[PDB]
Amino acid sequence: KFYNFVILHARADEHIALRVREKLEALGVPDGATFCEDFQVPGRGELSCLQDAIDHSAFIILLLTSNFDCRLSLHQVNQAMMSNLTRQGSPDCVIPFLPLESSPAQLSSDTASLLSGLVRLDEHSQIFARKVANTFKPHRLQA
């Protein structure tokens, strides 16, 4: 339990989430996790699975995509942001992520507008490794 980072994503985009978690593990962040890792299919529909992904993850990494426009995804973004804001501490746990496959032109107007004025992480940037190192510092959250 208490994984380092979790990758919230749409149901269809499984390969993108797997690639991103593998890459972030490769760059030097141990104990990688994804939404479909604690997405416990025995009955945890969206109450226990989503709250387990939010609560038991030091960093919540939202994965924007053209398929991230669905209403369920927007509700997940709202839930993650509100949990981050209400929870004591946790300055910038929610980290918007732009995958390599995605482009800045496919940002969801309805969904990604909530994250427009928040610190983003991009894969197209050539400073991506330094951004990851700065974000995932040795000192982090506790139990």
Residues that bind a second copy (CB under 8 A): 14, 36-37, 39-49, 51, 59, 71-72, 74-75, 77-83, 85-86, 91-96, 110, 113-114, 116-122, 125-127, 130-132, 134-135
Q: Which is nearer to a second copy, 27 or 85 (CB)?
A: 85
User: Based on CB atoms, which residue is closest to a second copy, 65 or 73?
Assistant: 73
Nearer residue to a second copy within complex by CB, 65 or 112: 112
Tell me the closest approach of the beta carbon of residue 63 to a second copy, in angstroms: 14
Please report how close the Cβ of residue 21 comes to a second copy at its closest, in angstroms: 12
Give residues with Cβ within 8 angstroms of 42, minimum separation 6: none
Q: Which is nearer to a second copy, 37 or 101 (CB)?
A: 37
What token pair was written down for 136?
């995932």
Shortest distance in whole angstroms from residue 111 CB to a second copy: 8
Amino acid making up residue 21:
R
Are 62 and 115 in contact by the 8 Å Cβ rule? The answer is yes
- Min dist CB 66 to a second copy, Å, is 18
Any idea what the Cα angle at residue 137 is, between residues 96 and 101, rounded to 5°?
Answer: 30
Using alpha carbons, select from 27, 28, 9 the residue that is nearest to residue 18: 9
Q: Which residues contact 85 (CB under 8 A, 6 or more apart)?
A: none
Q: Give the tokens for residue 94.
A: 């929610």
